Design a protein around this ligand. Structure first.
Ligand SMILES: *[C@@H]1O[C@H](CO)[C@@H](O[C@@H]2O[C@H](CO)[C@@H](O)[C@H](O)[C@H]2NC(C)=O)[C@H](O)[C@H]1NC(C)=O
Ligand SMILES: *[C@@H]1O[C@H](CO)[C@@H](O[C@@H]2O[C@H](CO)[C@@H](O)[C@H](O)[C@H]2NC(C)=O)[C@H](O)[C@H]1NC(C)=O
Ligand SMILES: *[C@@H]1O[C@H](CO)[C@@H](O[C@@H]2O[C@H](CO)[C@@H](O)[C@H](O)[C@H]2NC(C)=O)[C@H](O)[C@H]1NC(C)=O
Ligand SMILES: *[C@@H]1O[C@H](CO)[C@@H](O[C@@H]2O[C@H](CO)[C@@H](O)[C@H](O)[C@H]2NC(C)=O)[C@H](O)[C@H]1NC(C)=O
Ligand SMILES: *[C@@H]1O[C@H](CO)[C@@H](O[C@@H]2O[C@H](CO)[C@@H](O)[C@H](O)[C@H]2NC(C)=O)[C@H](O)[C@H]1NC(C)=O
Ligand SMILES: *[C@@H]1O[C@H](CO)[C@@H](O[C@@H]2O[C@H](CO)[C@@H](O)[C@H](O)[C@H]2NC(C)=O)[C@H](O)[C@H]1NC(C)=O
Ligand SMILES: *[C@@H]1O[C@H](CO)[C@@H](O[C@@H]2O[C@H](CO)[C@@H](O)[C@H](O)[C@H]2NC(C)=O)[C@H](O)[C@H]1NC(C)=O
Ligand SMILES: *[C@@H]1O[C@H](CO)[C@@H](O)[C@H](O)[C@H]1NC(C)=O
Ligand SMILES: *[C@@H]1O[C@H](CO)[C@@H](O)[C@H](O)[C@H]1NC(C)=O
Ligand SMILES: *[C@@H]1O[C@H](CO)[C@@H](O)[C@H](O)[C@H]1NC(C)=O
Ligand SMILES: *[C@@H]1O[C@H](CO)[C@@H](O)[C@H](O)[C@H]1NC(C)=O
Ligand SMILES: *[C@@H]1O[C@H](CO)[C@@H](O)[C@H](O)[C@H]1NC(C)=O
Ligand SMILES: *[C@@H]1O[C@H](CO)[C@@H](O)[C@H](O)[C@H]1NC(C)=O
Ligand SMILES: *[C@@H]1O[C@H](CO)[C@@H](O)[C@H](O)[C@H]1NC(C)=O
Ligand SMILES: [Ca+2]
Ligand SMILES: [Ca+2]
Ligand SMILES: [Ca+2]
Ligand SMILES: [Ca+2]
Ligand SMILES: [Mg+2]
Ligand SMILES: [Mg+2]
Ligand SMILES: [Mg+2]
Ligand SMILES: [Zn+2]
Ligand SMILES: [Zn+2]
Ligand SMILES: [Zn+2]
Ligand SMILES: [Zn+2]
Ligand SMILES: [Zn+2]
Ligand SMILES: [Zn+2]
Ligand SMILES: [Zn+2]
Lengths: 484, 483, 484, 126
């Protein structure tokens, strides 16, 4: 639209010198002890996803979008993360999770273990386990929490508590009899047994907690929502039994219970809101399911009781699933939800004593281009047709995935379809059932004490070593050491 | 102008429904406990001032201005404060400070005393003192802070610690000899003697602390900055004296020393950066003098340590002095600068355990308006000339004050002057040396625990009672009472 | 002065702690459904106007004044409303009316249209009309009412029913030929044809309803009171012709009629008491014309019948006119007369099911200062002389307007004059024929169901969105949905 | 009323009690009281040899619950114990009262030694 104020050189100069003035005050570094440590993991939030979601957030307020500032954009310090596994060039959700949560890079498909463990071979698990910053935080006396929109035993959350040779071992139902007889236990089982005093556990995965064929609380008639546990354990009951009886340990499963709890009285919370993954925010039930921001708000309110501090791992995890489905409007709307949650966390904590970190585990082959005009809808079309085949194309286009569509030898004239639809899959170069990850680097967004330590291009496993050093937990305690 | 997005009704409906969604979420009331408690006092910051200052803040960013949100515009809960003194319909600086700091409306010219005290007569003081929320805080073990751009013995800060019968009694130099014989202590003396453990004091009033005719450190070449105490006392030395010798106390006086400091290393701070009032933000020295925002930051950084919390009183003073001179550009810029401090203070603390309150003591006869178009500069003119004298007029106009100019029965043709100047005095109806206060109500902005308690039209003395009830301090502490 | 009881700190400490006690019981929030909605619009009654009126209401009782509690002061919840137009920093009576009645902000000089409409251009109206809460009420079966002391086709009441590109088109006599040819119609015609079953219409503007040169029913000899319509329509008859005949439709024009009527017996009321505006409360004929409070009670009693509820827009209309004239005593008495009608409405309705809002469209450049002693007459003098020219001045002073009076050189020595007169014009800084509006925010007062939804600093158009949510009318009916 | 003043200064989410006879002392749950005011006589308490077993506690009985309360704080505690009627016994020249007042404080020193640890508690007797 070319806003009138942007035609004036003084506007951009006044703004740049205002940005310059702030950077100069940032030289007075925040070097306090990080009493609280919060980590936002945008599953699949590549660099192209961040800019696309930024334009989306602004366009939801009838603005052009590109000048809009995300809550994560306002974070002072930015760095780049090399996301590769030791096993693979284009990484996976599990191996990266061990990197940025345990400080050690590992093979794909393996949470909580090193590269000495071979995937699916469990006779190689003993002696190769690496602990997470969530365990270091608990050992230091802090409260710990896990909030996600996927299964609570998914790859990204499981690295904070489990040590497994395969990400697919959700419960014993999905394990091979070799690994079970060899003595290895499920991510779900390890959720209630490895660290038995995790204060807040919220997300999906209700079915991996109950004996096989037990009907769900929400969807009683759905056969695919029934329990899976073949050993007959009520893991939700195992959870309650491991906590002392004078403590208030609740367990909830819908939105009404979460917003009714008084955080000042609940000591241990377990919230499981869907049988598997949770609905996309564009598909969420406002009556029965809480948003990711609503879960983050209550979690921080409970974890704040501890005088020693708290660690919180928040995962806007369904950004990754939306990209795999080739549906950008879903994945983009998942990112804006996490950014709203990031803004709520910044409201409930102070930068003086809380180090918050926003990053991803890896990217996707998602792009948007085409020389679109200023303020063009991120889901809209390019302003011109193809030189080659004379049909239009959307700004958003994928490298691969299910978006590949040829209407009989020729690719699809998209002026006939709803490319702005919630479920529209933009076209790709190579047809696959699922769009694949990307090998490019991701950003890291840091605010709080010692946030300036995440400064350049870094191996992904560097992230948790900074957060632990700032909180005086884990191996290096030199930040709380007396002299200097 | 008309932005393109505002021509679409869906924009205004989308905006209102987002606001309606946030209003519904606010039903989940914050009933926590105010571990910390911050009050921002905009001196003379009436309703007309906050709107013009909001327009100014946005206009600094090349936006029209009316659509800007101030930092205080983002506080959830708003109320109106009836500002009248018990003996003054249009109130003054001191008697209001007793209302919102002590909970008792008082007489004009008095601080820290009830209406039984009479001005300038001292044998009405004893038995009539009232204690303040700063005293109520320290008595409950919290830390306390006083940050301001006026003198630390100015009327508004003085009601935190002192109990004086005349606000003019800055040092003993400014007292009548009758009042000395009655055995009454000036405000500057009272700062270092009633609450002997105020952790953070920052502002002006340097020359009321040094002995008479003693040269000032920053302006030695000038004598109006010289010391004023006939006491021959040294309250800087005296300040340092009531702190435990093993605690870290500093005393600073320029900007370099302020940022040089390690807040994690200071227990008691005293900054006096000018002999009297501090220089307007529009006239401040970058090199030698700090801003209000800078002072609020390190103040909170020092006060954050106390495990039982702190109370902080920031006074964005000199908003009042700007209107008193009729120089609206200075008063508005002082108001914008206090809003930067509200922003910094909002980030260094959490709304979950810190109740922050923003208000004024009284207003001014400051108006603006000439059916000016959208985006018109707040210091600009109306679109039309006068239909009475065919001359232009500025959007900003004062009730009274020194802006009254008449070139012999002829009101000043303003197109011949720089009305956008920093020191321009917008025209007024009645000429005076100083523009007067205004008796109309002021706004109250609150966020944090029990901030919803400041809900409607309240007597000004009701403000500190709420902040007292939330922190579980003072004469009533039933908020922490397991019922 | 100092009242005796206020010398005791116990009096302020006790009075405050009783206010705290009430504010603590206000935590249990009224969440019932707004069966009735009542909006009070003090036209031009800004923050400084309400305080001066508070003093006046108390000084008419021989009390000091500042300690008076207006009926609106007793309202629990106060908010601030940003009043600017899309077109104007300092807004007008019409564009603001579209904001707080239609929920959309508009240009100055227009009613019931979005900002896409340009003033005085008729071909810019079609497609850009926006409806009012008075229509959302009627579409929900509620009864609707309009009570005012200005013309019924003035800017403020006409936003509830009209859609025009110019507030100035009172009757067809006032519109340009191009506007008539282009299809659109004058406001008075719209009052009878847009929504043709408005239950109660009261106020002035009688001369716009009858054909041209028709002698007024009151002033047979006054020329200017003759009718104005070139159409030829008798709009009082057109009003009668639109009602169902099994209902009782009464047209009245004087006070005796108004109090003759039996409310529980009349279904449609159109009362037009003056040719133009109504007289000020101070200049009001005690015999021929009714007070605003007398109109509010008769209006309510007729509107309580409908079991589904009612909506009622009341307008203290002549406050704006009083400030425009520089007559602070007239504007302040108009405000006090509206406040009496507020308390009148609080006794005939219950705050359990009736949401009542009192606010203003904008402000004026009206001030009062001078460090006046406690109890000083609001129309009185400042204690000191002007330290510059030795002559006294009143507490009340204006920014601009016709109060400016330099007597061939110096400004007027006001000890020689009548500064407490009904029609005295306090001195101003800039001379104008009419005093202008203020750009400052105005106050919102709310009592009743969901009155707490107006809490902080809000855009003006947010106000009807709240009233329409509590009343379960308009676009969003989520308050009556099966939830909590 | 300084007993009232003592109560008023305490935040009332804490448990403050105030007691005056021995039955109230031995009934308290030390795990449940944060602030305790125990004033058992108008003037000085009686000598141990003259103590009333039912209305008045011994020095050890007071020291035991005093330690039990002070231990709840994770940061530690300071406790001052005065077997201060030894002096009054010597002033009267009644050595049998003074020595019995001394033996009672030694019994208290033994009880304090059992409720704390040499590894983290410093005890001075003088
Ligand atoms: C959310 O979960 C709560 C707790 O299970 C549900 O509340 C129960 O509802 C059943 C009826 O379905 C009642 O018999 C129980 O007494 C309720 N329990 C309590 C503690 O109130 C609630 O219905 C669920 N809401 C939704 C939308 O599923
Ligand atoms: C792509 O599809 C669009 C419409 O589906 C085609 O454009 C329209 O074709 C119809 C039929 O001839 C015309 O009446 C319209 O004027 C055309 N334009 C529009 C904007 O609707 C377009 O030709 C197709 N392109 C290709 C390469 O198949
Ligand atoms: C700010 O204050 C400090 C403290 O007085 C100044 O530093 C002093 O500088 C003089 C000479 O330059 C030395 O003799 C003092 O010993 C210094 N004092 C300290 C504590 O270092 C500093 O120069 C001042 N800065 C400005 C800009 O006025
Ligand atoms: C107010 O002063 C301005 C000039 O400062 C007058 O306007 C100018 O008058 C001169 C000669 O009369 C013209 O040459 C200019 O073109 C005028 N316009 C401007 C913008 O300078 C104006 O007439 C004065 N007003 C009154 C009432 O005397
Ligand atoms: C109010 O208006 C009514 C109606 O016009 C007047 O009442 C009628 O007046 C006519 C002649 O003036 C009489 O023949 C009728 O009998 C009257 N009707 C009633 C019901 O009284 C009335 O005079 C007006 N009142 C005032 C004070 O002007
Ligand atoms: C303003 O007008 C008043 C009244 O006309 C003047 O007050 C009177 O002044 C005369 C002498 O000038 C005295 O004899 C009277 O006693 C005064 N009136 C009262 C009520 O005391 C006043 O002097 C005029 N002031 C100016 C500056 O013109
Ligand atoms: C020790 O003190 C307690 C508490 O005052 C006494 O118990 C009270 O006894 C009186 C009369 O026997 C009753 O009216 C009260 O209700 C009792 N209060 C409680 C809390 O039990 C007790 O009698 C005292 N014992 C001695 C020996 O003095
Ligand atoms: C682990 O067992 C599998 C088969 O059970 C075997 O193929 C593999 O070599 C074994 N590895 C080790 C280290 O024992
Ligand atoms: C969620 O709330 C919005 C509010 O308008 C509504 O439109 C939508 O239908 C709701 N969806 C669900 C699943 O409750
Ligand atoms: C002190 O107050 C008394 C009030 O009874 C008054 O009479 C006396 O004059 C005052 N002191 C002086 C020195 O005036
Ligand atoms: C303060 O800094 C600004 C930054 O550009 C500069 O323009 C101004 O001249 C400086 N003023 C002083 C007094 O240092
Ligand atoms: C509106 O009407 C005028 C009058 O002829 C015409 O010139 C103009 O083009 C019209 N514009 C629109 C947008 O209808
Ligand atoms: C209203 O009636 C009273 C009492 O008869 C009378 O004094 C007064 O003059 C009447 N109103 C007017 C405006 O005259
Ligand atoms: C209690 O006092 C009585 C009377 O002197 C005494 O016989 C007894 O030994 C005392 N001690 C007890 C009962 O433990
Ligand atoms: Ca659910
Ligand atoms: Ca200085
Ligand atoms: Ca009449
Ligand atoms: Ca006893
Ligand atoms: Mg995952
Ligand atoms: Mg002051
Ligand atoms: Mg109007
Ligand atoms: Zn992933
Ligand atoms: Zn993936
Ligand atoms: Zn003041
Ligand atoms: Zn002042
Ligand atoms: Zn108006
Ligand atoms: Zn008007
Ligand atoms: Zn002795």
């Amino acid at each position: 639209l070319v806003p009138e104020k942007e035609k004036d050189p003084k506007y951009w100069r006044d703004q740049a010198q205002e940005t310059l003035k702030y950077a100069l005050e940032l030289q007075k570094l925040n070097t306090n002890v990080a009493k609280n440590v919060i980590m936002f993991l945008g599953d699949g939030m590549g660099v192209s996803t961040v800019t696309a979601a930024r334009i989306l957030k602004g366009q939801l307020h009838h603005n052009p979008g590109e000048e809009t500032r995300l809550e994560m954009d306002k974070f002072p310090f930015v760095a780049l993360s090399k996301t590769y596994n030791t096993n693979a060039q284009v990484p996976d959700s599990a191996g990266t999770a061990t990197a940025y949560l345990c400080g050690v890079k590992a093979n794909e498909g393996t949470v909580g273990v090193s590269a000495a463990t071979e995937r699916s071979r469990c006779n190689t698990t003993q002696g190769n386990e690496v602990t997470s910053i969530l365990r270091w935080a608990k050992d230091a006396g802090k409260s710990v929490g896990i909030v996600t929109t996927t299964r609570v035993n998914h790859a990204t959350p499981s690295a904070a508590y489990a040590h497994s040779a395969d990400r697919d071992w959700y419960s014993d139902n999905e394990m091979p009899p070799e690994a079970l007889s060899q003595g290895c236990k499920d991510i779900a089982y390890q959720l209630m047994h490895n660290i038995r005093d995790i204060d807040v556990i919220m997300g999906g995965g209700r079915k991996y907690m109950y004996p096989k064929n037990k009907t769900d609380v929400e969807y009683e008639s759905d056969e695919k929502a029934r329990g899976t546990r073949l050993d007959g354990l009520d893991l939700v009951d195992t959870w309650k039994s491991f906590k002392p009886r004078y403590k208030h340990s609740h367990f909830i499963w819908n939105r009404t219970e979460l917003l009714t709890l008084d955080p000042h009285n609940v000591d241990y919370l377990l919230g499981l809101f869907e049988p598997g993954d949770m609905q996309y925010e564009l598909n969420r039930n406002n009556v029965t399911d809480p948003s990711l921001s609503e879960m983050v708000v209550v979690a921080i309110q409970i974890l704040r009781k501890n005088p020693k501090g708290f660690f919180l791992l928040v995962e806007g995890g369904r950004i990754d699933h939306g990209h795999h489905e080739g549906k950008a409007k879903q994945a983009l709307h998942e990112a804006v939800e996490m950014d709203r949650a990031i803004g709520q966390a910044g409201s409930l904590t102070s930068s003086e004593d809380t180090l918050t970190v926003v990053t991803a585990d890896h990217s996707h082959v998602f792009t948007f281009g085409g020389y679109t005009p200023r303020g063009n809808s991120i889901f809209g079309l390019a302003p011109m047709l193809s030189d080659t085949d004379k049909k239009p194309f959307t700004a958003i286009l994928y490298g691969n995935g299910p978006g590949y569509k040829v209407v009989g030898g020729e690719r699809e004239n998209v002026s006939m379809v709803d490319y702005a639809h919630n479920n529209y899959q933009a076209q790709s170069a190579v047809p696959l059932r699922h769009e694949t990850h990307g090998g490019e680097d991701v950003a890291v967004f840091s605010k709080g004490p010692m946030a300036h330590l995440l400064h350049g291009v870094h191996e992904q496993n560097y992230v948790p070593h900074v957060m632990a050093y700032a909180a005086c937990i884990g191996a290096n305690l030199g930040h709380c050491a007396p002299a200097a």
